[PDB]
Amino acid sequence: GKGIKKHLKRVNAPSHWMLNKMGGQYAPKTSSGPHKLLESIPLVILLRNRLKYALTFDEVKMILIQKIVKVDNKVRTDCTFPVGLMDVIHITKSNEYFRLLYDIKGRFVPHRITNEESKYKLCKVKKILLRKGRLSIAVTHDGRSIPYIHPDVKVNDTVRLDLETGKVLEHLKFQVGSLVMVTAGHSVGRVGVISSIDKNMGTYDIIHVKDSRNKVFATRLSNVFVIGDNTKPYISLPREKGIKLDIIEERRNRLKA
Amino acid sequence: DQFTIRVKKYMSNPLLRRKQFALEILHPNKGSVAKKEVKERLAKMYKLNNVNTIVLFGFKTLFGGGRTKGFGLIYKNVDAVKKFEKKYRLVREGLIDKETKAGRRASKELKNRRKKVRGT
Amino acid sequence: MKLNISNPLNNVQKSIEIDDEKKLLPFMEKRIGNAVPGDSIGEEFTGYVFRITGGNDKQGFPMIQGVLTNNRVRLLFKKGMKCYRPRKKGERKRKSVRGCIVGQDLSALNLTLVKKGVNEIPGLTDKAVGKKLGPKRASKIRKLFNLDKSDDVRKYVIGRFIKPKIQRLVTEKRLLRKRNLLQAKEKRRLEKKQQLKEYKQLLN
RNA sequence: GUAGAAACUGCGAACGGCUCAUUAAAACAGUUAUAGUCUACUUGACAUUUAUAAGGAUAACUACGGAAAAGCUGUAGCUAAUACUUGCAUUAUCCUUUUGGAUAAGUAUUUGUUAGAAGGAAUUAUAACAAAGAAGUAACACGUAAAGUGUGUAUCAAUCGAGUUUCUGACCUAUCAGCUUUUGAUGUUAGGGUAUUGGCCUAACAUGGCUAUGACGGGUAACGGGGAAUUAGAGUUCGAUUCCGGAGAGGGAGCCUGAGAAAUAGCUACCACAUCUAAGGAAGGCAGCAGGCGCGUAAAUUACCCAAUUCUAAAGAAGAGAGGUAGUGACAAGAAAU
Numbered sequence: 001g002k003g004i005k006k007h008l009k010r011v012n013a014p015s016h017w018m019l020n021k022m023g024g025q026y027a028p029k030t031s032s033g034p035h036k037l038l039e040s041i042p043l044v045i046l047l048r049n050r051l052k053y054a055l056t057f058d059e060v061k062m063i064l065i066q067k068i069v070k071v072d073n074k075v076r077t078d079c080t081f082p083v084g085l086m087d088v089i090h091i092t093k094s095n096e097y098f099r100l101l102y103d104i105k106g107r108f109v110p111h112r113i114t115n116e117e118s119k120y121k122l123c124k125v126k127k128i129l130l131r132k133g134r135l136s137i138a139v140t141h142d143g144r145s146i147p148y149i150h151p152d153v154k155v156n157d158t159v160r161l162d163l164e165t166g167k168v169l170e171h172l173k174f175q176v177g178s179l180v181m182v183t184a185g186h187s188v189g190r191v192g193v194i195s196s197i198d199k200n201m202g203t204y205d206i207i208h209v210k211d212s213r214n215k216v217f218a219t220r221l222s223n224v225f226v227i228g229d230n231t232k233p234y235i236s237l238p239r240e241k242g243i244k245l246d247i248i249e250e251r252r253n254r255l256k257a
Numbered sequence: 258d259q260f261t262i263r264v265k266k267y268m269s270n271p272l273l274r275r276k277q278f279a280l281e282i283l284h285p286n287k288g289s290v291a292k293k294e295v296k297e298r299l300a301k302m303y304k305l306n307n308v309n310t311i312v313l314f315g316f317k318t319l320f321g322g323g324r325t326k327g328f329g330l331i332y333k334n335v336d337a338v339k340k341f342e343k344k345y346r347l348v349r350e351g352l353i354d355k356e357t358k359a360g361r362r363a364s365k366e367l368k369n370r371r372k373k374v375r376g377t
Numbered sequence: 378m379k380l381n382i383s384n385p386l387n388n389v390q391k392s393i394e395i396d397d398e399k400k401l402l403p404f405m406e407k408r409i410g411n412a413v414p415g416d417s418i419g420e421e422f423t424g425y426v427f428r429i430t431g432g433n434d435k436q437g438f439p440m441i442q443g444v445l446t447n448n449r450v451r452l453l454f455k456k457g458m459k460c461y462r463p464r465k466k467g468e469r470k471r472k473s474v475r476g477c478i479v480g481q482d483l484s485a486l487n488l489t490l491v492k493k494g495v496n497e498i499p500g501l502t503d504k505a506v507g508k509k510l511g512p513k514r515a516s517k518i519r520k521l522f523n524l525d526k527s528d529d530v531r532k533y534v535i536g537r538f539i540k541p542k543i544q545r546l547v548t549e550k551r552l553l554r555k556r557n558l559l560q561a562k563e564k565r566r567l568e569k570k571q572q573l574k575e576y577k578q579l580l581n
Numbered sequence: 582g583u584a585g586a587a588a589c590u591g592c593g594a595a596c597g598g599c600u601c602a603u604u605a606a607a608a609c610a611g612u613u614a615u616a617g618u619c620u621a622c623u624u625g626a627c628a629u630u631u632a633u634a635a636g637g638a639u640a641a642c643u644a645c646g647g648a649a650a651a652g653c654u655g656u657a658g659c660u661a662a663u664a665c666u667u668g669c670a671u672u673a674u675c676c677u678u679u680u681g682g683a684u685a686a687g688u689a690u691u692u693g694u695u696a697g698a699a700g701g702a703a704u705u706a707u708a709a710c711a712a713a714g715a716a717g718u719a720a721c722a723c724g725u726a727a728a729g730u731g732u733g734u735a736u737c738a739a740u741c742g743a744g745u746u747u748c749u750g751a752c753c754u755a756u757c758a759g760c761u762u763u764u765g766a767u768g769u770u771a772g773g774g775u776a777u778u779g780g781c782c783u784a785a786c787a788u789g790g791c792u793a794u795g796a797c798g799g800g801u802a803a804c805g806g807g808g809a810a811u812u813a814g815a816g817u818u819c820g821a822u823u824c825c826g827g828a829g830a831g832g833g834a835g836c837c838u839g840a841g842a843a844a845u846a847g848c849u850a851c852c853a854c855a856u857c858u859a860a861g862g863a864a865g866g867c868a869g870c871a872g873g874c875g876c877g878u879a880a881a882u883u884a885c886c887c888a889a890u891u892c893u894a895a896a897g898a899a900g901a902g903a904g905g906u907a908g909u910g911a912c913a914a915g916a917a918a919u
Contacts, residue, residue: 001595467838
């Protein structure tokens with residue numbers, strides 16, 4: 001037959017997974033989740049090759065059996081949960097919160113997060129639809145549908161959704177003074193203010209982003225993430241702080257130890 | 258015989274209620290030493306009163322002797338030992354014995370027992 | 378030749394061994410389900426009326442009803458017919474069968490009595506064996522005991538000690554689940570009303 | 582309570598693994614569109630026209646058998662379920678204006694008539710009216726905060742995808758120069774059909790479409806690609822082969838179930854083979870992991886185990902010739918005694 005495929009070869013493991021060539025034959029194909037397979041990783045990989053909590057897949061299963069891992073302040077049990085672009089994952093046995101961030105080098109990395117700021121996740125809505133009786137709903141990259149949004153919120157804005165009540169708090173728009181992340185660009189991991197946009201008739205629209213070192217780059221409109229306005233990046237960025245570090249002077253920094 | 262103990266990447270895992278690290282034992286001019294000796298030494302190191310709560314594995318002595326790289330695991334109690342582990346490493350440690358050793362004969366007999374061809 | 382005569386009202390059956398052709402002759406050219414008096418089959422079986430209800434032919438092939446032929450004719454079998462055992466969901470197989478018509482081809486005949494005659498058969502029309510399973514559903518046991526909804530029937534179950542577990546009970550946990558669904562529905566209505574009211578508030 | 586074979590049911594079995602005969606703008610790759618569709622599991626929002634708990638219908642089993650035999654089967658009695666099937670309020674809106682009164686009651690899908698947050702452009706979202714009308718909204722089981730979960734159900738969206746589809750790209754050959762068009766060739770109109778669109782097909786009407794920028798043909802000891810061999814740089818040659826995609830399971834044809842198969846360790850029919858056969862009749866596909874015959878110069882064990890990866894399910898404790906290890910191994914490659 002020609003049904004939906006159910007395996008991924010180890011060589012065909014996605015780019016940012018960073019899995020060894022000889023360590024077996026197959027990598028897990030994430031079950032249908034809230035985020036795309038090409039841009040999210042399973043919790044098994046996340047806690048194995050980064051957290052290093054266990055040494056075998058079955059040990060990871062035994063960990064997952066206890067209702068200790070939590071996503072968006074609620075319980076999850078299936079070993080194939082892609083964490084997604086932005087979220088919060090909580091572990092109560094150690095009372096530690098992790099939040100998924102990127103690197104200027106193009107990967108996924110967990111970031112230690114305190115309890116107060118661990119209750120806030122930022123979601124970029126992807127679609128705006130109208131339902132029966134004039135109620136407007138927003139569909140997010142998070143695979144989450146938020147009904148009854150403000151008339152203020154537009155398509156590309158980002159929304160301060162609370163984890164527990166499942167309700168909006170505030171909106172953040174996309175002026176030339178709004179901090180935006182790049183999701184899957186070849187220059188992924190750069191934090192900038194965006195100098196301006198460039199809308200093209202019936203095609204992709206290219207937006208220019210400016211950095212803290214006056215570097216200017218361009219990116220497709222599809223894969224941007226409103227993270228905060230000119231005041232500050234609202235959430236805690238990783239150690240690299242989202243500024244991309246040039247190769248030669250990066251080698252200089254590495255050499256100078 | 259004397260030796261030196263070195264522990265790398267000592268990290269405690271509350272989720273398994275265990276700990277992990279790499280064992281580097283220096284025994285110059287003396288061949289590979291038994292695991293019981295270093296078990297006693299590490300018990301005294303970490304103030305451990307029982308011996309059956311330690312798992313050791315992957316002890317490669319490397320070319321030339323005088324060094325040994327290995328990975329060590331400690332347990333909270335025998336309950337955790339029997340709880341968060343499979344049976345083969347426990348067999349190697351010396352707490353339980355192995356199961357039936359037919360192998361693939363179990364599956365061969367399962368296929369042989371064609372359903373509703375055997376009244377029992 | 379081998380007649381399995383069964384009494385539906387006594388849940389028992391008995392095997393009778395006959396050989397003569399003309400003895401079984403009076404059952405000829407009759408479809409399955411016909412009304413025939415089993416007189417020539419035995420000295421005491423006279424008077425008995427039998428509804429011809431099963432048989433098996435010379436080489437072991439079964440009988441059917443719809444196929445009113447006279448020989449072996451292969452045909453299509455479905456998932457839910459009366460003489461097929463599928464190996465997979467929706468699997469079908471063609472299997473040789475013998476037609477409904479009765480002839481000189483049968484290894485055995487399964488017959489049952491519909492009207493009592495005159496004589497008696499040891500262990501067939503005298504004794505009886507019960508259901509060998511007690512009723513389990515609440516309505517079934519309530520109907521078979523005639524004690525309506527006055528008291529629980531859980532104390533009036535047949536002993537093999539060990540008792541079957543009555544279904545369709547009146548459990549307080551069932552009541553609690555019902556009240557939980559009701560209250561959850563009303564709470565959900567409350568939350569949706571709050572959301573729409575605050576949406577009206579934020580409209581301007 | 583702890584457990585429980587046999588059993589009905591759910592789910593997978595449509596994944597994987599193997600091979601390359603057919604394939605010469607077909608596949609394949611890059612790059613679109615789907616404003617022309619569907620979409621299992623999961624996740625998130627969330628619904629409309631007897632109840633102190635409703636009806637039968639049957640397995641395993643018990644009892645008589647039968648044939649040689651197989652994944653064979655009749656009558657009698659039964660009983661169950663989250664299998665099958667009937668079926669238990671209420672929500673929204675307007676006037677005086679917390680609140681009194683008045684009012685409306687169909688989700689998809691289909692047809693007819695109007696208006697009309699987004700996209701670039703709607704016959705979009707949606708609202709009103711006239712109609713039809715599915716499938717439901719819990720009659721199912723367990724136990725967490727010092728109320729919860731499981732199973733299952735209507736829609737929307739995402740997910741894991743698939744199907745059509747634009748554009749650009751190839752081996753040799755003219756001792757293949759004119760092809761296609763009664764049997765759809767090219768297009769228009771209307772319809773059937775499919776999940777959507779279309780000569781996909783039907784009826785009518787038109788006479789059209791390709792071509793020395795090499796069509797139509799013929800060969801290919803031709804699966805396509807990222808790749809491999811050689812490089813001063815250009816190039817030429819191999820590409821079955823770790824992976825992506827395509828096709829196939831003897832070679833055509835057909836078909837049920839199932840979301841998803843024109844599936845082959847599912848079925849049906851033909852031929853060619855070939856097995857067992859009490860001679861009446863049954864069942865077959867190693868181009869799956871091992872091994873046998875035949876072919877040829879040419880190619881390894883009828884080994885061990887799911888311990889590693891990862892899959893399936895009622896998902897920790899069970900299977901996995903996917904796969905790992907062992908065995909044979911002067912295919913190649915690297916280190917280094919005499």
